Write a protein that binds this ligand. Structure first.
Ligand SMILES: CC(=O)N[C@@H]1[C@@H](O)[C@H](O)[C@@H](CO)O[C@H]1O
Ligand SMILES: *[C@@H]1O[C@H](CO)[C@@H](O)[C@H](O)[C@H]1NC(C)=O
Ligand SMILES: *[C@@H]1O[C@H](CO)[C@@H](O)[C@H](O)[C@H]1NC(C)=O
Ligand SMILES: *[C@@H]1O[C@H](CO)[C@@H](O)[C@H](O)[C@H]1NC(C)=O
Ligand SMILES: *[C@@H]1O[C@H](CO)[C@@H](O)[C@H](O)[C@H]1NC(C)=O
Ligand SMILES: *[C@@H]1O[C@H](CO)[C@@H](O)[C@H](O)[C@H]1NC(C)=O
Lengths: 476, 49, 49, 467
């Protein structure tokens, strides 16, 4: 046999690949790019005021933030129509933007008594157990009163320094600039960004009715306890009103067919595991199917969890003078994309099983497979030295370089050096004794010696495989 | 310009309302040599000092 | 040769100008060596500047 | 018998190659670069206004365009580089119509109109504004010699609302002010073309210039430009007589080659498309025939511009000439490449060269079979990067952009300042797993094949020589 059985097993895979490709082409269009590009350039690439050149992307002080919040921010939220506020005369600013603050309390840490004459207070780094909850300043509104995480429908964020909660002191802004500017001025006069503040969030969203794509915008600013400002941004093109055009029904039908295909595969895998050979995991061709089906079922579960959860849109459509809460939907969309992008990768990778249709491809596959059993040991022995260099660099230079400021950053820096991108022109300033020594040793031992065993093993394996397959003709 | 630099950016950094508690006054230890130098011919530097 | 650079802003600035005009740093004067301190109670780390 | 025929073939090929090399090199004059560079620097670099710096290259709003059409454009076109105008410039507009969605019923009360992305089925053929003339009435594509353009976002049609300006500055300024006073650049606009041509009598070189401004359905402005210089006299001195003689002898050479090929294929019914040195000769012949056809087509109609130096008052339609010039260049530049490559059959006369030739001919099958397994993984990574980074980096926006970015990464030109911040997880994973599977594994396999085959072929050839 081996032919009349594989032909069905091949066409069933080809149809699966076609459906997956249709889905991938469907979700990713070419209109999201320019949408997000203009949306980002409107807020990030514009100076706070015409008399300086410090944009939100390069904030450096607590004072610059106030210049930003009344400035390039208000100028890019409210556009006078030739009341509603269309950003680019196409994008609709639905709802109102909301600002929020996360801060810690006075006396959150301890100082020694021998120098407790000059140090009058300390503000410890942000922690859920050290977060202030008392009302400060003038106790008028929601901007000076703590609010629990469940009363804001919020969640965690996982910023750059730490993972911030969903609570804090929040404030909703108006619809016209005339009142939003007054509110911001009121916040700035009665000092609101004190020394105790640790994080600030700004959130809003737009519609852009021409195409059907919501865009949710979040801006984070972090204040480390050691001083400084760290900005971050996130623009997400969500889509929530899918069924309008025929292509949408086409995509839904392809999704249904995809679910049917994955159900078929899981059934034929359970049948094979139970009604046939047990513990068939020494193949790498069946350990790939389980990964694909698990990733697919996780993606389907996430889609069912998220798509069926859209009542927040209905609540916003009831009254459209309140802040819409679309933060969870963007997070789940990001998670769904991160899963689909890996699923399609493995689906494409699986195609290698189907290419043995002549001598050359078969022998290349044999060489590639036989060369994996022994490359594994050298890969481990090489990665051990790689991590040794990584930890050495992290311990030595990981305090002044900022390219080695984190372990994974050290790994990426080493890989970039391997590609030939990073030069040590700053390492001497970082260190003059152990800098050039480390650089020379790394670029000599792991680029002239260690990196050639990979070539040697492959070269020898291919040579012996070809010689064996040629000798396989002296017997026949 | 060292004097304007210190008078403009450093002194406001050391003092102030709260302004980054210091734990210690500064110092200006300084060496002289006693072997009076002469300016090099025009040009920043030829090889080294 | 060291200078304490005063305690508060006004006296320190006045003494800085006083030593500036009296030619403290215009001669050979190989180095200047300004270095004071730093300490952050929030994290519990000192810093030599 | 072998040497005689081989040397005859070699000498004929050398004459063909030298004729082609002279013919192509005589078509490149160094002033074309200077002309295009100065034209671009004049029309695209000068500030829109004295107090502003937003040149045409950095347009950012539908209002800056209205300043450009009254600022740098008029100054550059109606100058004090020392060129003169011919004909009259034309400005054309492409719009879409209101009501081109099925608006969701939920929020249909708030919004009231779509101006959908540009498409043939959604074009606005109805009149609008004051129904004065051509500037407010739809004109069919056939009525006006038009053709598609293939802009950055989409391919536009040849129809639209057109208007022809005047010759001097005052009337064109008045017409532009009249267009600005009314709403001509409405919210429904999707494309704006400005077209004209100049002569620059100082050095004989026509120039056809086309500027395009695109308004995507999500706001913003996308500018693009195209400057095409032309030389269409070609009979001025002895040099171009030499060029014409070279042209005619080239035609004779290609005639001889095609008749030889047709006789040869008459001899061998099939099995003739496997030597791979005939499959390339036929490609060269076909490319040369296409090039000569294009040259005949674009030299048949050249007289039409002659009655434009007489200072007429109309629009000179010069898109076809520029397009066919570009096409003819893009064909010459490939037939030259292939005729140069074909030369790898007359340098096997040595010993080392013969070994290299048989090496490359003996390891072509393995290289081609492995370029499939390499490109499958390459495309898998391309699709992964497109799905993850295809919205915010700007280096993975389109699909082919991902492939080109990966190829640049192979040359060691990674940025990594945006890959790591666009997706903190699954981005660095992609970057690290891409370098380990390319520089360590998949680029050490080509060398292994080329290292083994060379040794094998040298051993066999040396044994045969010593046999
Ligand atoms: C109405 C208009 O401008 N369309 C022109 C027409 O005038 C011209 O006759 C033709 C070529 O002759 O090209 C087109
Ligand atoms: C913060 O607390 C300290 C002592 O814990 C005390 O001086 C006061 O309550 C706060 N500091 C200031 C400057 O108000
Ligand atoms: C706070 O409330 C007081 C009295 O209720 C009012 O006078 C004041 O304007 C409010 N806003 C402030 C202090 O920012
Ligand atoms: C949070 O969710 C509740 C649930 O209905 C909703 O009423 C409320 O408006 C939301 N927002 C806040 C700030 O409570
Ligand atoms: C666009 O069409 C809608 C359809 O009802 C209409 O209400 C709206 O007024 C139109 N736009 C303009 C600018 O008239
Ligand atoms: C349109 O009307 C006539 C021709 O139809 C013309 O004289 C006039 O100047 C044009 N413009 C306006 C604003 O009427």
């Amino acid at each position: 046999k081996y032919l009349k059985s594989v032909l069905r097993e091949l066409v069933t895979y080809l149809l699966f690949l076609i459906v997956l490709c249709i889905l991938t082409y469907g979700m990713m269009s070419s209109n999201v790019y320019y949408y997000t590009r203009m949306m980002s350039q409107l807020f990030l690439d514009t100076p706070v005021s015409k008399t300086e050149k410090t944009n939100f992307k390069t904030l450096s002080s607590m004072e610059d933030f106030w210049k930003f919040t009344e400035g390039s921010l208000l100028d890019g939220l409210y556009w006078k129509m030739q009341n509603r506020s269309f950003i680019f005369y196409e994008n609709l600013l639905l709802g109102v933007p909301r600002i929020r603050q996360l801060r810690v309390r006075n006396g959150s840490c301890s100082i020694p008594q021998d120098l407790r004459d000059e140090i009058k207070e300390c503000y410890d780094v942000y922690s859920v157990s050290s977060e202030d909850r008392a009302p400060f300043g003038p106790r008028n509104g929601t901007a000076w009163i703590y609010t629990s995480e469940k009363d804001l429908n919020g969640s965690s964020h996982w910023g750059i320094i730490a993972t911030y909660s969903g609570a804090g002191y929040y404030l909703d802004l108006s619809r016209t600039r005339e009142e939003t500017a007054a509110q911001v001025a009121s916040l700035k006069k009665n000092v609101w960004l004190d020394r105790g503040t640790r994080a600030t969030f700004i959130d809003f969203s737009v519609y852009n009715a021409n195409i059907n794509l919501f865009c949710v915008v979040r801006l984070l600013v972090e204040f480390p306890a050691t001083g400084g400002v760290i900005p971050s941004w996130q623009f997400q093109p969500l889509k929530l009103i899918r069924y309008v055009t025929t292509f949408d029904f086409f995509l839904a039908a392809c999704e249904i067919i995809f679910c049917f295909f994955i159900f078929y595969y899981v059934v034929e895998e359970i049948l094979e595991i139970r009604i046939h050979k047990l513990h068939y995991f020494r193949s790498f061709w069946n350990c790939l199917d389980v990964v694909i089906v698990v990733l697919s079922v996780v993606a389907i579960g996430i889609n069912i969890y998220r798509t069926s959860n859209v009542e927040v849109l209905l609540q916003f459509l009831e009254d459209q003078n309140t802040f819409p809460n679309f933060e969870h939907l963007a997070y789940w969309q990001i998670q769904f994309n991160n899963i689909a992008a890996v699923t399609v990768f493995f689906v494409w990778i699986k195609l290698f099983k189907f290419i043995n249709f002549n001598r050359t491809m078969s022998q290349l596959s044999t060489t590639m497979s036989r060369c994996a059993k022994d490359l594994f040991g050298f890969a481990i022995m090489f990665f051990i030295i790689f991590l040794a260099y990584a930890q050495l660099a992290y311990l030595v230079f990981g305090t002044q370089v900022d390219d080695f400021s984190t372990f994974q950053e050290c790994i990426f820096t080493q890989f970039r050096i391997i590609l030939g991108d990073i030069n040590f022109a700053e390492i001497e300033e970082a260190n003059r004794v152990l800098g050039p020594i480390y650089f020379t040793t790394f670029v000599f031992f792991m680029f002239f010696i260690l990196l050639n065993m990979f070539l040697a093993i492959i070269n020898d394996t291919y040579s012996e495989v070809k010689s064996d397959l040629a000798q396989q003709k002296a017997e026949m | 310009e060292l004097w304007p630099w210190m008078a403009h950016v450093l002194l406001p950094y050391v003092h102030g309302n709260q302004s980054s508690p210091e734990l210690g006054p500064p110092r200006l230890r300084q060496v002289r040599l006693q072997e009076a130098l002469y300016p090099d011919p025009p040009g920043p530097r030829v090889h080294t000092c | 040769y060291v200078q304490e650079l005063g305690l508060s802003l006004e006296e320190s600035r006045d003494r800085l100008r006083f030593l500036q005009l009296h030619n403290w740093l215009d001669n050979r004067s190989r180095a200047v060596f300004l270095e004071l301190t730093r300490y952050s109670p929030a994290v519990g780390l000192h810093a030599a500047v």
